[PDB]
């Protein structure tokens with residue numbers, strides 16, 4: 001109860017900034033998450049005995065893939081922490097609790113393959129879940145781990161609060177399906193412009209939380225150039241392995257996943273920043289003004305990719 005987590009000075013200061021990198025020491029990532037839960041939520045939010053056992057079961061159910069791994073889980077939860085801390089009064093006690101856990105769990109048991117590859121392969125999960133295939137799997141795995149003896153970090157919520165938090169986590173994890181992001185952001189764009197956006201409207205909050213999830217999930221592009229550049233290698237390592245597996249099924253992959261088209265990566269990154277990242281953090285900045293540093297960092301990295309193309313690196 002009187003047992004805080006403390007970080008070294010540099011981490012204690014940098015963890016509050018959006019562009020924080022959690023570092024290469026895996027054994028510090030659980031403590032960093034607990035630290036973020038305590039400052040975001042309270043030292044009372046969760047029984048430390050149960051939280052620590054939940055964290056270690058979640059860690060175990062992430063795989064050793066190049067990008068969709070335990071480091072990504074903690075990276076995405078830190079972005080959510082930074083968003084929640086810079087928007088103190090806009091979120092209920094349940095939402096702060098739910099969303100850090102949703103972020104930690106959002107890619108549970110990822111295999112390093114897209115929903116598309118599962119459908120072309122004809123993977124059992126694609127029969128069980130026809131849309132948002134992996135994302136419905138991630139929420140399933142989350143629920144399973146919550147029901148292991150000693151892992152129910154929500155036990156002390158009331159029956160109705162318990163149902164509200166699981167519902168927040170389900171919508172939050174489904175929203176990480178990038179296919180659903182485009183429509184969600186177009187709707188939020190119209191609602192903000194015509195002036196009908198209303199955060200006391202539950203359907204509206206849902207939409208806003210979904211965009212927050214997309215923004216935390218894409219946060220690779222809001223780091224300092226050397227983190228962004230080195231993370232892009234891990235992402236392409238998964239994508240090119242999936243492209244290889246497509247070729248094995250006798251399907252030419254999209255160039256994004258074809259390791260023979262590495263030359264086209266800089267131009268492919270421009271398309272991604274312009275079609276996905278910039279719009280995401282722009283709409284997010286419009287709704288939650290204090291998330292502007294994410295948009296600023298994203299534009300900086302766009303500019304760095306433009307320099308790669310112009311031969312300057």
Ligand SMILES: COc1ccc(CN(Cc2nc3ccccc3c(=O)[nH]2)C(=O)Nc2ccc(C)cc2)cc1
Pocket residue numbers: 220221231232235236255256257261262263264265266267268269271272275276
């Ligand atoms: C931040 O890290 C990242 C690393 C990789 C990626 C992969 N990526 C960029 C990309 N890279 C290529 C590479 C080679 C050849 C061709 C391409 C190509 O056409 N796309 C996308 O997601 N593109 C995209 C997706 C959706 C829309 C709507 C528009 C564009 C994205 C982000």
Ligand SMILES: [Mg+2]
Pocket residue numbers: 106107134176177
């Ligand atoms: Mg995912």
Ligand SMILES: [Zn+2]
Pocket residue numbers: 072076106107176217
């Ligand atoms: Zn993710």
